[PDB]
mmCIF file of C-alpha atoms in Angstrom:
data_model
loop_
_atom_site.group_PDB
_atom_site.id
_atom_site.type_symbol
_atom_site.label_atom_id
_atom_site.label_comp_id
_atom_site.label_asym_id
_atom_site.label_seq_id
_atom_site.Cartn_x
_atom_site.Cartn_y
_atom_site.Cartn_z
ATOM 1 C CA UNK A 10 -83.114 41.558 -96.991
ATOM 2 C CA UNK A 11 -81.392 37.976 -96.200
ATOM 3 C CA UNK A 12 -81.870 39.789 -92.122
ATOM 4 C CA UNK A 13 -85.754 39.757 -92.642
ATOM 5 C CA UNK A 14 -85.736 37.244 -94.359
ATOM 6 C CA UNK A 15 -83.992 35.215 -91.847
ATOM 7 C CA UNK A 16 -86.562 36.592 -89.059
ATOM 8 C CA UNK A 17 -89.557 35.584 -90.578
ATOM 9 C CA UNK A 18 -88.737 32.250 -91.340
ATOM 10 C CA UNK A 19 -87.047 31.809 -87.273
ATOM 11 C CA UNK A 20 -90.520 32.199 -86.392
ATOM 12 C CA UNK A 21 -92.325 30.157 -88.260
ATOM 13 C CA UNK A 22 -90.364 27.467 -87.340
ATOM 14 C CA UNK A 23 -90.478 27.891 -83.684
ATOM 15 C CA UNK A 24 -94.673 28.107 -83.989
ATOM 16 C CA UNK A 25 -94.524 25.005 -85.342
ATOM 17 C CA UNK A 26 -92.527 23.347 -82.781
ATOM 18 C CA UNK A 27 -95.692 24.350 -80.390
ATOM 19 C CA UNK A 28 -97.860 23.064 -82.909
ATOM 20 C CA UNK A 29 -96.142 19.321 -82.865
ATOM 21 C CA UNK A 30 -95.782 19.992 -78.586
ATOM 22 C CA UNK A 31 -100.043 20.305 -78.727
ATOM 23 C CA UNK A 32 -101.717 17.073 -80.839
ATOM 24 C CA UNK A 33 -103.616 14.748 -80.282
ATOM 25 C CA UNK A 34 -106.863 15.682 -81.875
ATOM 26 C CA UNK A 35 -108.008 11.933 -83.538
ATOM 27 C CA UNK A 36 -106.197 9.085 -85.631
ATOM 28 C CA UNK A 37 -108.814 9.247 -88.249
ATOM 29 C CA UNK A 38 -108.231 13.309 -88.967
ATOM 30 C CA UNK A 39 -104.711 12.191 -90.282
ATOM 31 C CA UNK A 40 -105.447 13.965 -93.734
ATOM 32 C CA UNK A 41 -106.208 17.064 -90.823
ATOM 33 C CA UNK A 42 -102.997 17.295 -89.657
ATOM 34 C CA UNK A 43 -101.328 16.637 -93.185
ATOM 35 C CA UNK A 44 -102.931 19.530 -94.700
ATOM 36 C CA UNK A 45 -101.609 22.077 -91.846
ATOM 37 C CA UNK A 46 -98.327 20.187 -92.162
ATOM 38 C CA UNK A 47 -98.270 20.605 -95.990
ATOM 39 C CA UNK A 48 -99.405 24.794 -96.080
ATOM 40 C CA UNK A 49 -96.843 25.101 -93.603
ATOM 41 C CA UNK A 50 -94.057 23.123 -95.388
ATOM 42 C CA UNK A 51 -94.587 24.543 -98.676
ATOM 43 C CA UNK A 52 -94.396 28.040 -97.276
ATOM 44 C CA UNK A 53 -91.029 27.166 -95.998
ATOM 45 C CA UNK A 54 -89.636 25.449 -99.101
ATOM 46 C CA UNK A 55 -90.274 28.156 -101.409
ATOM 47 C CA UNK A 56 -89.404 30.769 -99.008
ATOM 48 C CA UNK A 57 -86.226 29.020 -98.293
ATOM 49 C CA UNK A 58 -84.937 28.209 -101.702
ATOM 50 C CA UNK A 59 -85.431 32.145 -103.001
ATOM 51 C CA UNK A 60 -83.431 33.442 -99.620
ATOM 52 C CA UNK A 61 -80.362 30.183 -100.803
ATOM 53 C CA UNK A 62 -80.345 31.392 -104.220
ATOM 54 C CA UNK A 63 -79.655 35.449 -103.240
ATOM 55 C CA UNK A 64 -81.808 36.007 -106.777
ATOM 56 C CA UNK A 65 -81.272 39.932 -107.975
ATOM 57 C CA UNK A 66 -85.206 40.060 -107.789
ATOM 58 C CA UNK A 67 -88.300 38.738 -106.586
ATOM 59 C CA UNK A 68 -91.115 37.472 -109.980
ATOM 60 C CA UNK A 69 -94.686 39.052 -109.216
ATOM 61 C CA UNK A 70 -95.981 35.706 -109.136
ATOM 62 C CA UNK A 71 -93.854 35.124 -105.594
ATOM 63 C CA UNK A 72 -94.876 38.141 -104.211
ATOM 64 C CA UNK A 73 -99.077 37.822 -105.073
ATOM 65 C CA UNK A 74 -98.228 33.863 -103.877
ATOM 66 C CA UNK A 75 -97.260 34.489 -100.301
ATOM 67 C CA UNK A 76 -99.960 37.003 -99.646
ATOM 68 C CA UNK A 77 -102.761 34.634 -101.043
ATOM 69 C CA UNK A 78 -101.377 31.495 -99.394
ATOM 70 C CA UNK A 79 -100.856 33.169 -95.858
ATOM 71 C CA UNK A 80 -104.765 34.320 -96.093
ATOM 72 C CA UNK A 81 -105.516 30.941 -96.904
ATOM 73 C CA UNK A 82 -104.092 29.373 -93.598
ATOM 74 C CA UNK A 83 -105.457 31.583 -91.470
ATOM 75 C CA UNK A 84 -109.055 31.062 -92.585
ATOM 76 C CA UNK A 85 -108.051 27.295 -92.064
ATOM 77 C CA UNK A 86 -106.788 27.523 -88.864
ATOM 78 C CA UNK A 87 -109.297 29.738 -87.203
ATOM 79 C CA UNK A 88 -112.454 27.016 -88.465
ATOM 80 C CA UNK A 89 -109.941 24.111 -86.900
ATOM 81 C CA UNK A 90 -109.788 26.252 -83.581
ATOM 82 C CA UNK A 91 -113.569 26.714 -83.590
ATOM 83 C CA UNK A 92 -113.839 22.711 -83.514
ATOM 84 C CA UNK A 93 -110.886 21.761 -81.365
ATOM 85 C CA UNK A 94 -112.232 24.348 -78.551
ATOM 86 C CA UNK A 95 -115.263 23.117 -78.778
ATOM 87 C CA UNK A 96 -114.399 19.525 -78.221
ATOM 88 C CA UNK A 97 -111.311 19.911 -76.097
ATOM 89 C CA UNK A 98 -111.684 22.380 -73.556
ATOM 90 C CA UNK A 99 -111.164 23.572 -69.629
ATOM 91 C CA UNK A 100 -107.568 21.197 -69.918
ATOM 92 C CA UNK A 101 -104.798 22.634 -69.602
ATOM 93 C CA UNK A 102 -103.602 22.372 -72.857
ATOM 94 C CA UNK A 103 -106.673 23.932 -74.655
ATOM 95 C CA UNK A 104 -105.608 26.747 -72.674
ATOM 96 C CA UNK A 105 -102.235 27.200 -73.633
ATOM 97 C CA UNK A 106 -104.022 26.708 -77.907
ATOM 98 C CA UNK A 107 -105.660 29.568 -77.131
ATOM 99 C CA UNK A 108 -102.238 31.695 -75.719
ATOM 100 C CA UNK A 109 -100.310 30.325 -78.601
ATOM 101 C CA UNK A 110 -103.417 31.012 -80.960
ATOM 102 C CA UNK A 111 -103.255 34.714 -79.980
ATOM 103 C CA UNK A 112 -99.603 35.190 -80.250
ATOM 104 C CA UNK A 113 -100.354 34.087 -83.946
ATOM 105 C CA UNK A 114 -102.409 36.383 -84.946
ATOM 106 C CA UNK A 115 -100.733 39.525 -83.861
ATOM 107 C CA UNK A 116 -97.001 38.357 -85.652
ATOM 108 C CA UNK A 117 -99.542 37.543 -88.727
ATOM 109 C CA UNK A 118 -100.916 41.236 -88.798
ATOM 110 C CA UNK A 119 -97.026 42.587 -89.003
ATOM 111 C CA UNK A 120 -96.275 39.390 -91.574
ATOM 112 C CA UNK A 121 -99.199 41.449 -93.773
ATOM 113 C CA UNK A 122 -97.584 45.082 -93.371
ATOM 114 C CA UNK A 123 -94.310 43.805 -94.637
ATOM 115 C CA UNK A 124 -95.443 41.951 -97.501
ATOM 116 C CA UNK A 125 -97.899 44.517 -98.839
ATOM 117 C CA UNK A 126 -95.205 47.122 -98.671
ATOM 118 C CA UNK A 127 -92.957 44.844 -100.880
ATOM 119 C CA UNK A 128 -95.745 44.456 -103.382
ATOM 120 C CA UNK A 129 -96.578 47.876 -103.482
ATOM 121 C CA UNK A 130 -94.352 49.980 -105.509
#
């Protein structure tokens, strides 16, 4: 539990370090940047305060929470690549987006499995 736990939060955190490492989109997209910030906090927070507290259980309402929210970024984040691509692009750093950008998706597909096996009885 607190093993998984740990792992899945490790890698958030280092995703985001990649995501400071690329910016530099516009000054006046500063709500932009706030609202990836914010998803990505808040997932955190809550993730990290139920892991310090070593509860006995889980509520429903966590469980249903993380699945929604996680579908929610990644709707968010694929319309923001669409625009940043077609913008920025042939740099060197668009490149690397993408890389990161596919990396992403394939540690979000196993982020899924776990979850719905926890929900699932």
């Amino acid at each position: 539990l607190a093993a998984a736990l740990a792992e899945i939060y490790k890698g958030l955190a280092e995703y985001q370090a990649r995501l400071k490492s690329l910016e530099g989109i516009s000054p006046e997209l500063g709500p932009a940047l706030d609202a990836l910030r914010l998803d990505m906090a808040d997932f955190a927070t809550t993730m990290a305060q139920a892991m310090e507290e070593g509860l006995d259980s889980l509520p429903q309402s966590f469980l249903l929470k993380a699945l929604e929210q996680i579908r929610k970024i990644q709707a968010d984040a694929a319309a923001l690549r669409e625009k940043l691509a077609a913008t920025y692009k042939g740099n060197d750093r668009a490149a690397a987006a993408v890389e990161i950008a596919a990396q992403l998706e394939a540690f979000l597909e196993k982020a899924y499995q776990i979850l719905r096996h926890l929900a699932a009885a």
